[PDB]
Amino acid sequence: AALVVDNGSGMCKAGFAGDDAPRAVFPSIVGRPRKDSYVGDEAQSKRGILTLKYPIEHGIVTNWDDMEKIWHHTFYNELRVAPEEHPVLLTEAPLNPKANREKMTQIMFETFNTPAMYVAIQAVLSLYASGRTTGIVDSGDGVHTVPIYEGYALPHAILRLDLAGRDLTDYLMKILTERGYSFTTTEREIVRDIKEKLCYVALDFEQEMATAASSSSLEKSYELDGQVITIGNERFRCPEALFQPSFLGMECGIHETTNSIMKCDVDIRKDLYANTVLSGGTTMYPGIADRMQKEITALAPSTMKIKIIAPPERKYSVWIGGSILASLSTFQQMWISKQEYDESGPSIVHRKCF
């Protein structure tokens, strides 16, 4: 079996190629005492006696020593396999520095002795999962609008937005506190749950605010120790920040950023408009697809055909795309083999994983 490992800024997803879903998902954290190293859920569970590190906080690996520990954890603890016995498909963020790609390659072959490996861009895998090779795609925990044409991401048109799930969770804690409650402590986990369960994107912000101000029709209850609290306009005000970052003191929203299309050759822009795919946990808010449709339509030419694709399984579309790719007959010749690595070294990744 080939392994598929999706390296996420907040959560890593791991499993076996061919499967419909990852076998394991865990926090991208490594902790050491304030057993010497803790990784994943355990690090989170015992965070009280540990100092936590986030080696891929914004999608890009910043500490390779701890990233190596996350991968070790992935193989031996989560999947219970020996990496030297299975090819490994890894995912990377859009605009990942070339040097990082070589580092990942060297670590897999030299540290884990993988028989074969490959690295693919997250957004590209999500597009594959939707059955397309062309389109524009990703909102996760700590961080993109990625135009893709014929399977190739267009780096010049890729845009990064340092606004994602983490920021939305903290913003919800802030407005719930302003409501009269008090969510300030690492309470952050509780609010993250409230966010994932009761939030939604309003089709029209002002109208929704007016409804919530004059009635209780949008209110939902949430039970903590038994205390039941009420969440009102906070339900949609929280994700509204994706469309209006100023609510967070940030100077463009996701609809406006999806600018990426305008940076592409005019001849493929219509293909992108007609194939705008959503992926990532932060795109799971109910109502987000219709809101994007409305907002993009307002920005694009009146004669443009706009279509937003929001797969029900988009939270794991990156991993699923990797499972699909690694299972393709034509992809087998694409793996970087240990032989090829020994022949050309780490830099082969640029040619093999273009």
Binding site: G131, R132, N275, P311
Partner: protein, 59 residues
């Protein structure tokens, strides 16, 4: 609306029945809803003809 999208889905079965396509009622609603997403239909013609091919190797 669900009454309209039922009729439009019921008419579309007949034009797939006289065109002699093997698509039954269940696989049709799967493919109609999947085409409704926005996938290109030139590719779906190949997956169904291959899924039906590997299915025959079992029997």
């Amino acid at each position: 609306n669900l009454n309209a999208v039922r009729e439009t889905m019921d008419v579309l079965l007949e034009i797939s029945r006289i065109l002699n396509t093997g698509l039954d009622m269940e696989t049709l609603s799967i493919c109609v809803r999947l085409c409704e997403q926005g996938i290109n239909p030139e590719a779906l013609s190949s997956v169904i003809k291959e899924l039906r091919k590997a299915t025959e190797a079992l029997k």
